[PDB]
Amino acid sequence: TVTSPYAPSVNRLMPYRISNAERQISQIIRVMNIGNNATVIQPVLQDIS
Amino acid sequence: NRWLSSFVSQVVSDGINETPLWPQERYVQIAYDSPSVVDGATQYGYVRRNQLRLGMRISALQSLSDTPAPVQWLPQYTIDQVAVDEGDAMVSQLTQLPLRPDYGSIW
Amino acid sequence: SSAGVLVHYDKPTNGNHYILGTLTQMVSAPPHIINATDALLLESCLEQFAANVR
Amino acid sequence: VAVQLFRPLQGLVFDTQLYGFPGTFSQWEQFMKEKLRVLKYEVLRIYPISTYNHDRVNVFVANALVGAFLSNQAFYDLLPLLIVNDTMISDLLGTGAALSQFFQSHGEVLEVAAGRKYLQMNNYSNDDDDPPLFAKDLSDYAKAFYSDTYEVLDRFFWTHDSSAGVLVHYDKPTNGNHYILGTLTQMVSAPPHIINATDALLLESCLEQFAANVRARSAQPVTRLDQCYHLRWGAQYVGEDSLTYRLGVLSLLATNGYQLARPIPKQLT
Amino acid sequence: TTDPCAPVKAFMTLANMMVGFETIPMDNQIYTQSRRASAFSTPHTWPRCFMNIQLISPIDAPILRQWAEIIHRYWPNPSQIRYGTPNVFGSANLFTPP
Amino acid sequence: YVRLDRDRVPTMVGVTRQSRDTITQPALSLSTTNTTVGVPLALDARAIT
Amino acid sequence: SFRVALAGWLYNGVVTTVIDDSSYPKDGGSVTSLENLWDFFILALALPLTTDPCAPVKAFMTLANMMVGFETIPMDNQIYTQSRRASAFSTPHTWPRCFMNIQLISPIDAPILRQWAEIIHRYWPNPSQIRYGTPNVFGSANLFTPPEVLLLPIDHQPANVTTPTLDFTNELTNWRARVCELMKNLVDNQRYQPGWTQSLVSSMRGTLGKLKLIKSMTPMYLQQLAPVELAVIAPMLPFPPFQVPYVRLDRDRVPTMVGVTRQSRDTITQPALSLSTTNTTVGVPLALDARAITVALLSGKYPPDLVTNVWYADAIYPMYADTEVFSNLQRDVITCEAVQTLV
Amino acid sequence: EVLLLPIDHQPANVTTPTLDFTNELTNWRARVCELMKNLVDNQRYQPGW
Amino acid sequence: VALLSGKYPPDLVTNVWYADAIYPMYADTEVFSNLQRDVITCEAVQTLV
Amino acid sequence: TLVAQISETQYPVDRYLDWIPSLRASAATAATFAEWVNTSMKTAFDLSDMLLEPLLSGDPRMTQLAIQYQQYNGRTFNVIPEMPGSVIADCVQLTAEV
Amino acid sequence: GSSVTGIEIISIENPGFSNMTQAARVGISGLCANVGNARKSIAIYESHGARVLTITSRRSPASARRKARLRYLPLIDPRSLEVQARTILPSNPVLFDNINGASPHVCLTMMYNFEVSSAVYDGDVVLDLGTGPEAKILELIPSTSPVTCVDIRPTAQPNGC
Amino acid sequence: ANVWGVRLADSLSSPTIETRTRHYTLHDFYSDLDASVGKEPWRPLRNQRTNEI
Numbered sequence A: 001t002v003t004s005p006y007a008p009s010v011n012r013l014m015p016y017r018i019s020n021a022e023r024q025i026s027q028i029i030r031v032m033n034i035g036n037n038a039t040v041i042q043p044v045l046q047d048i049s
Numbered sequence B: 001n002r003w004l005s006s007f008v009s010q011v012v013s014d015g016i017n018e019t020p021l022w023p024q025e026r027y028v029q030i031a032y033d034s035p036s037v038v039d040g041a042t043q044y045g046y047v048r049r050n051q052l053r054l055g056m057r058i059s060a061l062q063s064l065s066d067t068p069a070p071v072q073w074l075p076q077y078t079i080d081q082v083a084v085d086e087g088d089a090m091v092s093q094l095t096q097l098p099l100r101p102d103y104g105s106i107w
Numbered sequence C: 001s002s003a004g005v006l007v008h009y010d011k012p013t014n015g016n017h018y019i020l021g022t023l024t025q026m027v028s029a030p031p032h033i034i035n036a037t038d039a040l041l042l043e044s045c046l047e048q049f050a051a052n053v054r
Numbered sequence D: 001v002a003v004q005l006f007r008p009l010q011g012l013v014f015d016t017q018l019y020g021f022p023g024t025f026s027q028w029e030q031f032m033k034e035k036l037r038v039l040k041y042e043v044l045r046i047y048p049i050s051t052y053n054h055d056r057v058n059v060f061v062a063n064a065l066v067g068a069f070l071s072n073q074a075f076y077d078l079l080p081l082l083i084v085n086d087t088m089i090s091d092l093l094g095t096g097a098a099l100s101q102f103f104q105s106h107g108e109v110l111e112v113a114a115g116r117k118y119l120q121m122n123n124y125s126n127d128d129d130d131p132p133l134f135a136k137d138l139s140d141y142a143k144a145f146y147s148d149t150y151e152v153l154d155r156f157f158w159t160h161d162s163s164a165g166v167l168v169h170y171d172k173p174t175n176g177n178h179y180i181l182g183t184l185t186q187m188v189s190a191p192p193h194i195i196n197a198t199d200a201l202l203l204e205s206c207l208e209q210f211a212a213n214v215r216a217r218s219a220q221p222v223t224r225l226d227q228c229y230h231l232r233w234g235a236q237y238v239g240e241d242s243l244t245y246r247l248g249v250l251s252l253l254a255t256n257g258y259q260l261a262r263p264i265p266k267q268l269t
Numbered sequence E: 001t002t003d004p005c006a007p008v009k010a011f012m013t014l015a016n017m018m019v020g021f022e023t024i025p026m027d028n029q030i031y032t033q034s035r036r037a038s039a040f041s042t043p044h045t046w047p048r049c050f051m052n053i054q055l056i057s058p059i060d061a062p063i064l065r066q067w068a069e070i071i072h073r074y075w076p077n078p079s080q081i082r083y084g085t086p087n088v089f090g091s092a093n094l095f096t097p098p
Numbered sequence F: 001y002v003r004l005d006r007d008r009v010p011t012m013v014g015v016t017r018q019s020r021d022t023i024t025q026p027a028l029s030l031s032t033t034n035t036t037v038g039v040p041l042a043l044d045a046r047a048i049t
Numbered sequence G: 001s002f003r004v005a006l007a008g009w010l011y012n013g014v015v016t017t018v019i020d021d022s023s024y025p026k027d028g029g030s031v032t033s034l035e036n037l038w039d040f041f042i043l044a045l046a047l048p049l050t051t052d053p054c055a056p057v058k059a060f061m062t063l064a065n066m067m068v069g070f071e072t073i074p075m076d077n078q079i080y081t082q083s084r085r086a087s088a089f090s091t092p093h094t095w096p097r098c099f100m101n102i103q104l105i106s107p108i109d110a111p112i113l114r115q116w117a118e119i120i121h122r123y124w125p126n127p128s129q130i131r132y133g134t135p136n137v138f139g140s141a142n143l144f145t146p147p148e149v150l151l152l153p154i155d156h157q158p159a160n161v162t163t164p165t166l167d168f169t170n171e172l173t174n175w176r177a178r179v180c181e182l183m184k185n186l187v188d189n190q191r192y193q194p195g196w197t198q199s200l201v202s203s204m205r206g207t208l209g210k211l212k213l214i215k216s217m218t219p220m221y222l223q224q225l226a227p228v229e230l231a232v233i234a235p236m237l238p239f240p241p242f243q244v245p246y247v248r249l250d251r252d253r254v255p256t257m258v259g260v261t262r263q264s265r266d267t268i269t270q271p272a273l274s275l276s277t278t279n280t281t282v283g284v285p286l287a288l289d290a291r292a293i294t295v296a297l298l299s300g301k302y303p304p305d306l307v308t309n310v311w312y313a314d315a316i317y318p319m320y321a322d323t324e325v326f327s328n329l330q331r332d333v334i335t336c337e338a339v340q341t342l343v
Numbered sequence H: 001e002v003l004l005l006p007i008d009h010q011p012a013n014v015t016t017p018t019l020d021f022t023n024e025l026t027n028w029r030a031r032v033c034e035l036m037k038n039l040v041d042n043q044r045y046q047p048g049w
Numbered sequence I: 001v002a003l004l005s006g007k008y009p010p011d012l013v014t015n016v017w018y019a020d021a022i023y024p025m026y027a028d029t030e031v032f033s034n035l036q037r038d039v040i041t042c043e044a045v046q047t048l049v
Numbered sequence J: 001t002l003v004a005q006i007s008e009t010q011y012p013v014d015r016y017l018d019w020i021p022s023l024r025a026s027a028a029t030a031a032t033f034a035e036w037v038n039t040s041m042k043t044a045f046d047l048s049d050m051l052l053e054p055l056l057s058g059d060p061r062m063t064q065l066a067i068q069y070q071q072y073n074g075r076t077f078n079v080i081p082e083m084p085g086s087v088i089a090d091c092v093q094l095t096a097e098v
Numbered sequence K: 001g002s003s004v005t006g007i008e009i010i011s012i013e014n015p016g017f018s019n020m021t022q023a024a025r026v027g028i029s030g031l032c033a034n035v036g037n038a039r040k041s042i043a044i045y046e047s048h049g050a051r052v053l054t055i056t057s058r059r060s061p062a063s064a065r066r067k068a069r070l071r072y073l074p075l076i077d078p079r080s081l082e083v084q085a086r087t088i089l090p091s092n093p094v095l096f097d098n099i100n101g102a103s104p105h106v107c108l109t110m111m112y113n114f115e116v117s118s119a120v121y122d123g124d125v126v127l128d129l130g131t132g133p134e135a136k137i138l139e140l141i142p143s144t145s146p147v148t149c150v151d152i153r154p155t156a157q158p159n160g161c
Numbered sequence L: 001a002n003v004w005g006v007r008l009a010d011s012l013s014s015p016t017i018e019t020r021t022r023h024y025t026l027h028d029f030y031s032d033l034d035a036s037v038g039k040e041p042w043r044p045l046r047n048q049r050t051n052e053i
Ligand SMILES: Nc1nc2c(ncn2[C@@H]2O[C@H](COP(=O)(O)OP(=O)(O)OP(=O)(O)O)[C@@H](O)[C@H]2O)c(=O)[nH]1
Pocket: C008, C011, C012, C013, C014, C044
């Protein structure tokens, strides 16, 4: 459970929200890299393990 | 066993004692008009409470017979009257109409 | 006398006496379990109801 | 060799070994008759008939209750939900009892697990003359998503995987509006073919509607005007020359009122 | 032992010992049939299927049914001995007769 | 000593030593102005057997 | 902590006193934990003394979080869960609809939880007000309250020392008795503590009975003599009391912001909001110690020869002998004239 | 916003978990054990037993 | 072996366990910068094209 | 019998020393006075272990004495013992009357 | 209960020996007025730990025409049902229960009844000679005409209403 | 009617005559002890469905 303030702000700026098209294109390029290697894949699985 | 279970389930249920008789400990009291004569044959333990009555008559249970099929009935009418819509609402409360009956044969 | 003591008052078996039931239980009536001081009383009660009708 | 199940006992979602039924049909029915009396006594003990005689009972709870009692799965949590109030679905959506073997809410979309239209015996051994069971004899062959509006259901299936095909009914469904989603189990008692139960449900309903078309008489009412399903969403995953597509076409034809040139028997094989 | 909940244990002991061979319907999903036997120390936690010998199916859990019958019918009975003399002394007992 | 009467199994034993607010009668104070007593003790089933 | 909480009643509109974050159970807690049960008891007795607009909701959701897995309540959206930390309810928009309306908590599903909610709604303390100062001579610096009124977050009655310690008419004594009885009901059947192999029901019962019938005079003090001391101290303070209304459970009247304006009423200018509006609460928060407040509520005592007239005369003399009201008045004159001259 | 799985998921009802047999993996194990149980047959599968 | 042997701790409540465990991994905002990286990747691709 | 002279109790004792002044007693005054009575009745009779401590950790102005237990079904049994006289309190009241 | 011709049955709980309340009496009277002197059969039995009796009978457009006359529904006397201390097992309801078909005497009587009903118009004063204890003519002619009838044996219909 | 389960109202009966007691003598003891075909000291109870002792 995270918490957030409730009062008049000072107009911050934190650009993070992006579109599903950008997410998908980045995923496609990243798969284009990672596929066929397995030496950058198996460490990922061991980390998740 | 099944009959005894049903009887005990009836006795331990919700409701109230609708009779004038409440149990004591000094003595088992007998109503003023009970047909039992046991106090006339016992020397100790019985008392006829004169000031409690039971308005019901005295006669053994008369049970009719059972039959495996329904029997015809013929209604008979009296003087009192009520509203037709009231009767229709009551029959709608008591009904069981939504059922599929065996059709039969016209001809 | 906490399980209830029962008298008979009419014509007991071998003279005047009280009865005191133990805490055993009847099992052959599945939905209910009676501790035999209700069992003796229920038996005699049903027997008297039978005798009234006949 | 088998048994078909009706209104009271139609919620047998669990595995077959948990119930421990006898083998022969006579022993089976005697067993179940002697157990349903105990269930009846419990239900009557909690609900007196005189005070609760003429009020709607929740069908989900009733089926789940017999199913839990037959498998010894702590049916008491189901008892205070047996009498409906204000809806047969919103009651289960608003309840907070911990019972997820039988159903689980998803924010205005109740999810119940359909179970065991049929039931198999010992002497049923995949014979060419045994009746087909259409995969509805084992535990989990599909899931039912009940709601109040098809708009809400359609919006539910945006973030839900509908690739085995989702089936609607549109005519007079069992307990209100709902979609059906079949799992990936398979029917084996038809040796040359193996169907993944989303073709099985559709084939069963389709043949039933073809049967009903031939026996119409214009003066004999039926319990339902069409039995077909009309697959709704997952068609993008099944194109030409697939059994699901062909069965969809046949079900559309049967709904419009066609008839098979070959006579279909009264008890399929 | 003087524990009032002694009888419900030695029933749930065997119920625990045989899980996967016979089953009985419990009250809820917390005090299930696999819960320990020592945890049933209160009158509030005695199983409905123990207070009713009927929910133990005679051909589903025959040995549990027999053990329930044995507990209900052959568990030892209390009694009393009548010590003391209240003539010189008094009687310090409160919830029994002197 | 109740054998198997679940209805008669005892649940508490408490002593009172003062009335509550205004109720002068102990028969009315005792229900809500008591302190419960009792301690459990463990035994060895194998030694007993 | 006890004295600072007692003194923060006079400054509701500037500083808001909340219970410390450390006082809540660890990781939400659980009813199967004796330590978390005593955590809940220590916490539920300190909350009614804080000038936090939403103390009741935190008191409810502490047990609502501890009760996860054994009882449930209806939720509002598909985002939050019953197991969200009770200390995160710091604003009126977080109050559960099932808390604002009792009948959404089914008693067949949340017995203990609905009992706790019902207790919160019925026996939570009632605000009140007491007169102080002399508005006919010293004026009155009250802004949002009438000219001679001192709002209090609890009820107060006339003062007498000859009153029963175990008086369940007193709101604080009644609250303690109700909390002890509810925890008793919680631990009775062992429906929520599967895992206690032994039988600690009798021990829990006895210790809760002791906590209930403890011989404390702090509730009597807070009811009778605390308001008198506050009203005697108030007109002599350098910074006089600045209060905002105490609403008990009426959500729609809970204050949420306090700003200052410097522009006229028939003009439109830059929306230069004041600097005090940028607070999540109504004022500068400060955390108190639930443990200290609870132990101070449990262990109070008077001198065995207290005579009220003598004591308060002897205390009032040396503090009115060192008063500065007559200088603060002239200071107020100069401040008003300075403001008008600047304009 | 979807994650596929090669087995059936079903949420839990209690936070104090206790063992039960009703799940597809235990059913799979039971099916396997029963097959080998009615496979063990010294006549026609293991002569020397 | 992992399937045949498995045991929870003797006295655990899953709400408390996961509330303790999951918390450290949700205080690291390494996931919010990957979105900016995806922004820049798509920008570079379109600029090249 | 002594506490009812300086405070308000629920026991019907006569009062002779009302013409003597006294403060409006409180819990602290009652507890103190009871402690002095206890110490005096120990010093006389030559005792050294806990004559009256069980009753002093409450409010001595309303001291009663009883016990009870409660069955599972809510039924309750209590034992409110009779309060036999005390020649010491009788002599104290006589001395006050004199 | 929507079709003008069909079956209709009700179930009321009568525990042992008792005088049936006003509600059950009104319900049975309403069913009688709805049926209109067709055959009526009863059954008494214990169903789900309760003792209840059911009354089965069919309705008809002649029944509706009779019901259109009476202003206040009469009330039967419950003695003949209260006296029943027996058990009468039920049977499945059937629309056309008569399996042997009507008899020629019944058919001739129905020819006569149809002739009467066709002869009588609306709003006409009539008088039948020897109707019987059951005024069957009340179900034949329209419900808006005085029907003063005579018979040597005393009637069995209501009076007033 | 009725207390909790309905009892026959409208009438009420009970026995009227009671047989006089008979003392138990050694001849009676011996005759009961040598159980003859007509009068044994026991009596079989049998099930109401299978009709067996
Ligand atoms: N061992 C002892 N058994 C007694 C003596 N005679 C009767 N029994 C018991 O005496 C008890 C009291 O008998 P009664 O007061 O007459 O009541 P009851 O209805 O006649 O009892 P039953 O004859 O068993 O139906 C019963 O529970 C009998 O089992 C016997 O001679 N010696």
